[PDB]
Design a protein around this ligand. Structure first.
Ligand code: MG
Lengths: 71, 342, 237, 231, 155, 257
């Protein structure tokens, strides 16, 4: 997870998965490690689920993920 | 079938280790424990006719090969391997030799490789000048000249065209110039002349050393001392010269101090990177030494007797052209040594 | 730099030394150089054709060869200013080599940017050994890549199966997609089949990236902390 | 039949033909035996590297022409060949390396193992300033005599007494030895520290494995400081 | 792509991941969400209900057995064996879950044999693709359509 | 380009096959056709890449640890294994084409029969062959390979692989078929192997394995079907193990001279 606050104006955070920047949708709540870590959240590795992958006309890949949290 | 032979040795080798191990055990025991008890036994024993045989046979056997002998004088592969016990696992050294055995036999099973370029073969298996094609020269990158911005327009006649911001050297001319240069090397080698290979760009040493070795020539890979030819007595007089016969074998004749100070001038100079060796080229001109050099698009052709148009920046291109010249020299040397035999 | 004279005339200067007697003994190279004379002309040579596209260099189209009107509707009755300028320089300037394939190569990699990410080896093996039949795209000895498409397109236009270059190019592109899809499946399936028989792998590509990112993110953590403490002290001023 | 004079070395025209020829010979060996593994005792830091001095190599490596970096290059290749595993080495490598080993075979060492005497005593001498001390260390119960007198009588300063005890305190053997120290010259400090130095040197015979700890504590180093005539 | 023995299956995911009263209504339970292609190797089955979780189940036995031997030894757990086994178990589970529940089954509709036994005798070493081309031109799609479940029109 | 190696006495092999094991048609399938099939696919997979200049054995080692190069690994492993099998079942490794030699009586060496007794609790070679035939029939449901291997501890043991499983590198032996059910003991072996691969510090996650094959038997349908038929692979393995070329098998055991 790159940012500790959802992308401004967007309801989704950003993740760095496999050399691509994806939009991560959380189940309901954001794990508490976010507030705790803060701006160092990128220092930790989380598990994600890749929902879909799309291709835009600019030649980018629109990867949508889901922050699988231990439960 | 004959394994027992080796087994017989190993048996002795094991026994030898046992004898040595317990020789060291008795070296720790105090003499007071053994000596007096041992002497007492002899004081309580009586020598027999046979016992006496060894009383003097061993005295001489120890007075001949231990005392009155000359302490000095006026399995071939890996002979220092310490084999491990048949129950113990392989040692690190044995695993290395076990892998080497696999590498020779099994490691190359399954397929052979064809039409693949191996860099070392340019130096060790150079082609003959007559078998060189434009394709071969092009495969080595000899056609790739300098940036058109760095053009020395005196090379115009060697240029085939410009492509991707560089000048393309005409390989048809490179081949003709290379063949002419190769014949010169062969001639000088067959005549017994001194051929010096000069190249001071990083990585050229390996090619330069092998070229000199197979032509019985000389090379310089580090630095051309300015004055090596024009100021030879102040630079090279101290180094040793030698006399050789027509077979290039040292005659062993001691040389008079007069003969050991005389300038020894190369009969032919080959320069891999002439743009960085202006000093050597000018000395060659001053000393009337014919020269061969690879001439790139930014290099001056008239500074050398026999130019070879070609890329001088790639080690593959240089080593390809050097290899051809080196083999040409080798053939000249072999033809000179053959005419001496017959 | 001046055209040098003394490098190519070593034989003649040496011959004067020998004839006069200044040099007693003939050098070993002397006979060899005499039999193989150096080239000593060092001239600039004209060229009348571009070897790449066969364009003729040095030809002037006379007004008699342009009898019909031009795109503007006007006839040409006299030489223009360009026709009256001497063009000797064009004879001596190294011709710019051009190839139609270069245009297609740029197109292919503009349409398929990620083909650039497939590493290419520029080191040649032996150009003379290439025995390729471009009736098919796959060839023994070379990879499947953009060049396979370009050479296939040229064969189609050369055999006149297609007339327009675009149509031949599109035909080759689909052949390329089919081969790329069969290889993407052979690799996925091979991995799947191996794991099903007990193959174990230490580090995956995704794992390799995570480890490398951690190494960088650890150094970045230290510096951030250090530079967020110098700022606090410097700002306190 | 016809004879001619040619340069002896292939590197004749180089800056240092003698050094380059020797380097080439070593490089050939390192190429021919590139596969041979290296010693794993190198991690154990085997204490063997008797290579000739820069000046000695200058006799054979070009004399004045020899440059320090050229000597450094020779050592990097001599060590690499030397560090090949002893079991897997061959004669060729050893033959080439023999010419570079510092010659110290005709001569021998001057050190004989120290041992306890007929009465179990370790005798060592120490010096500090102008003072000297000869101590007799034997296994005992911590009894000390200085010139036949009690320690508290001869040395009034407790810091001098503590200096004498320090070597025994390092090996934690204060109550395991009887010391009979004899000292002369200088003053109380020189004598107390000269005894300290002599006890440390005498304790190594009882257990040579503790020499490293004694050296690290600094009791085996002879203090060189003495009164200097003003200059 | 299959190197040795195996089968390429045309399957239909069963939209009955509820597990409640499962396999009680030959129509309400025979409903297919989406079709898929699946490869099985050697004697592998395309159903996935009788074999999903096998490794997770065996993994949990191994950890418990190792944890009980550790207790006999008397060890204070570990720094990352409880966090590594947990992650291994959490991934094993999340990768076998269904859209709603964790009962994902598949209905065989078609199967192509990849074993060399089938095609080596008639087509040779180089004719597997020729075999697969003639297989496609030899499929009676009536039998496949018959096996097809009824679509789950929850949409 | 990877080319099919030339085999000794190839004219005889193309006329009378391999006596007592394969016919002429059977040998054309296993070697002249399948080896060509593998080498061509390997060349297409590796041409234009650094792997093109490496022999198949080195390719499999280089690619053994790379999940997405498994296709290249399978081709390299199969190519190496097939020439290991064709080499120890070959009438004569030396080319007696102009010598017309018809007397090749090769028998197990003393070192081989000494290591067999040491590693198999005194079992004879004949008994070990029966265990090898049994292991092949019960552990290799489909395609695979049967090996007699030697490890770093001088012990000969039997390894079976599924499809193209290398004997050299235990993480890729493919000795357990996970399509079917596995016992807790087999899962323990897999779990222990995974732990060893995780102890390696290398960024390539590779371990050291010094196992080497001694005998190779091809259990693929390309080797037996045409001559034996479905279900008769145990009669094929029996013939192979009874007609091995022991000049090659003996040379594969390290002696140390
Ligand atoms: Mg250049």
């Amino acid at each position: 997870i790159l940012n500790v606050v959802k992308e401004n104006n967007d309801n989704k955070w950003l993740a760095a998965i496999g050399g691509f920047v994806a939009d991560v949708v959380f189940f309901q709540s954001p794990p508490s490690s976010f507030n705790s870590m803060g701006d160092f959240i990128r220092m930790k590795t989380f598990l994600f689920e890749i929902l879909e992958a799309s291709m835009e006309k600019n030649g980018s890949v629109s990867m949508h993920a889901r922050l699988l949290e231990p439960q | 079938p004959n394994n027992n032979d080796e087994v017989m040795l190993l048996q002795q080798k094991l026994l030898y280790d046992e004898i040595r191990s317990e020789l060291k055990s008795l070296s720790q025991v105090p003499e007071d424990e053994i000596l007096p008890e041992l002497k007492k036994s002899l004081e309580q024993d009586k020598l027999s006719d046979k016992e006496q045989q060894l009383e003097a046979e061993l005295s001489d056997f120890f007075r001949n090969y231990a005392l009155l002998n000359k302490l000095f004088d006026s399995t071939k592969p890996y002979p220092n391997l310490i084999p491990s016990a048949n129950d113990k696992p392989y040692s690190s050294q044995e695993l290395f030799l076990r892998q080497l055995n696999h590498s020779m036999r099994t490691a190359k099973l399954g397929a052979t490789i064809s039409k693949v370029y191996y860099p070392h073969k340019d130096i060790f298996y150079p082609p003959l000048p007559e078998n060189i094609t434009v394709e071969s020269l092009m495969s080595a990158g000899v056609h790739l000249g300098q940036s058109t911005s760095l053009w020395r327009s005196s090379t115009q006649s060697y240029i085939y065209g410009e492509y991707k911001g560089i000048h393309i050297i005409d390989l048809n001319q490179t081949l003709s110039y290379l063949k002419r240069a190769a014949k010169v090397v062969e001639g000088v080698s067959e005549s017994g002349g001194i051929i010096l290979f000069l190249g001071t760009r990083q990585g050229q040493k390996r090619g330069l050393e092998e070229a000199a070795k197979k032509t019985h020539g000389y090379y310089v890979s580090t630095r051309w001392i300015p004055g090596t030819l024009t100021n030879s007595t102040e630079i090279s007089g101290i180094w040793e010269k030698q006399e050789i016969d027509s077979n290039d074998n040292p005659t062993e004749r001691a040389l008079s101090p007069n003969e050991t100070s005389k300038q020894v001038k190369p009969d032919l100079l080959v320069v891999l990177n002439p743009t960085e060796n202006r000093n050597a080229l000018l000395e060659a001109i001053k000393s009337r030494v014919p020269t061969i050099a690879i001439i790139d698009t930014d290099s001056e052709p008239s500074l050398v007797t026999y130019p070879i148009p070609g890329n001088d920046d790639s080690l593959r291109s240089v080593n390809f052209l050097l290899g051809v010249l080196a083999r040409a020299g080798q053939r000249g040397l072999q033809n000179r040594l053959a005419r001496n035999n017959e | 730099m001046k055209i040098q004279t003394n490098a190519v005339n070593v034989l003649q200067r040496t011959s004067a030394y020998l004839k006069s007697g200044l040099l007693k003994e003939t050098p070993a190279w002397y006979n060899v150089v005499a039999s193989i004379p150096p080239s000593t002309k060092f001239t600039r040579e004209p060229r009348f054709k571009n070897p790449s596209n066969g364009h003729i260099i040095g030809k002037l189209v006379d007004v008699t060869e342009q009898p019909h009107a031009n795109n503007k509707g006007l006839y040409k009755t006299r030489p223009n200013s360009s026709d009256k300028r001497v063009g000797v320089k064009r004879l001596y300037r190294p011709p710019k080599l051009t190839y139609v394939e270069d245009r297609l190569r740029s197109l292919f990699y503009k349409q398929h940017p990620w083909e650039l990410s497939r590493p290419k080896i520029l080191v040649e093996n032996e150009i003379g050994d290439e025995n390729y039949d471009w009736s098919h795209m796959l060839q023994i000895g070379r990879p499947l890549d953009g060049e396979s498409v370009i050479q296939r397109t040229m064969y189609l236009i050369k055999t006149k199966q297609y007339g327009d270059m675009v149509e031949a190019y599109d035909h080759a592109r689909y052949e390329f997609y089919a081969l790329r899809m069969q290889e993407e499946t052979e690799q996925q399936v091979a991995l799947e089949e191996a794991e099903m028989f007990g193959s174990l792998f230490g580090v995956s590509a995704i794992e390799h990236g995570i480890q490398k990112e951690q190494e960088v993110l650890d150094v970045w953590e230290k510096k951030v902390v250090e530079e967020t403490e110098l700022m606090a002290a410097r700002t306190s001023n | 039949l016809p004879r001619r004079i040619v340069p002896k070395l292939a590197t004749f025209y180089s800056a240092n033909p003698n050094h380059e020829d020797r380097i080439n010979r070593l490089e050939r060996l390192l190429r021919k035996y590139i596969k041979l593994p290296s010693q794993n005792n190198n991690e154990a830091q085997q204490t063997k590297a008797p290579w000739i001095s820069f000046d000695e190599y200058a006799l054979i490596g070009g004399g004045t022409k020899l440059k320090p970096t050229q000597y450094t290059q020779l050592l990097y290749m001599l060590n690499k060949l030397h560090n090949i595993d002893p079991q897997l080495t061959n004669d060729e490598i050893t033959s080439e390396l023999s010419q570079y080993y510092k010659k110290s075979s005709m001569l021998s060492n001057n050190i004989k193992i120290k041992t306890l005497d007929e009465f179990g005593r370790s005798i060592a001498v120490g010096k500090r300033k102008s003072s000297t001390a000869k101590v007799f260390v034997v296994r005992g119960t911590g009894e000390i005599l200085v010139n036949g007198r009690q320690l508290n009588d001869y040395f009034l300063k407790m810091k001098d007494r503590e200096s004498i005890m320090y070597p025994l305190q390092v090996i934690e053997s204060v109550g395991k030895y009887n010391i009979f120290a004899t000292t002369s010259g200088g003053g109380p400090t020189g004598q107390a520290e000269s005894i300290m130095h002599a006890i440390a040197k005498a304790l190594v015979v009882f257990n040579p494995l503790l020499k490293s700890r004694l050296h690290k504590a600094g009791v085996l180093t002879r203090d060189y400081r003495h009164v200097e005539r003003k200059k | 792509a299959i190197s040795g023995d195996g089968f390429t299956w045309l399957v239909a995911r069963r939209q009955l991941d509820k597990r409640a009263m499962r396999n009680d209504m030959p129509n309400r339970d025979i409903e297919y969400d989406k079709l898929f292609i699946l490869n099985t190797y050697n004697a592998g089955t395309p159903f996935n209900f009788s074999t999903s979780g096998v490794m997770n189940e065996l993994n949990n036995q191994y950890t418990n057995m190792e944890k009980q031997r550790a207790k006999e030894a008397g060890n204070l757990e570990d720094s990352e064996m409880t966090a590594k086994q947990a992650k291994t178990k959490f991934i094993y589970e999340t990768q076998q879950k269904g859209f709603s529940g964790k009962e994902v089954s598949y209905i065989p509709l078609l199967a192509i044999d990849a074993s060399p036994k089938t095609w080596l005798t008639d087509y040779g070493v180089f004719g597997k693709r020729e075999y697969l081309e003639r297989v496609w031109d030899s499929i009676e799609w009536k039998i496949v359509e018959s096996r097809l479940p009824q679509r789950t029109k929850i949409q | 380009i990877h080319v099919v190696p030339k085999l000794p006495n190839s004219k005889a092999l193309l006329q009378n096959g391999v006596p007592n094991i394969l016919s002429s048609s059977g040998f054309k399938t296993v070697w002249f056709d399948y080896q060509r099939y593998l080498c061509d696919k390997l060349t297409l997979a590796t041409a234009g890449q650094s792997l093109e200049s490496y022999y198949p054995f080195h390719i499999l080692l280089k690619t053994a640890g790379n999940p997405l190069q498994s296709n290249i690994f399978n081709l390299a492993s199969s190519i190496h294994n097939n020439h290991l099998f064709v080499e120890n079942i070959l009438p004569s490794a030396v080319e007696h084409g102009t010598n017309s030699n018809a007397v090749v009586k090769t028998e197990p060496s003393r070192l081989f029969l000494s290591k067999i007794k040491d590693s198999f609790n005194g079992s004879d070679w004949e008994v070990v062959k029966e265990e090898m035939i049994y292991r092949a029939e019960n552990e290799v449901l489909g395609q695979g390979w049967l090996f007699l291997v030697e490890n770093n501890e001088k012990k000969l043991f039997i390894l079976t692989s599924n499809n193209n499983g290398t004997p050299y590198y235990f993480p890729r032996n493919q000795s357990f078929d996970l399509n079917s059910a596995i016992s807790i003991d087999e899962f323990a072996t897999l779990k222990q192997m995974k732990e060893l691969i995780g102890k390696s510090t290398k960024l390539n996650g590779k371990v050291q394995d010094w196992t080497m094959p001694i005998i190779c038997v091809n259990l693929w349908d390309h080797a037996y079907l045409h001559d034996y038929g479905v279900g008769n692979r145990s009669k094929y393995v029996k013939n192979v193990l009874d007609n091995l070329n022991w000049s090659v098998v003996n040379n594969r055991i390290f002696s140390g001279i």
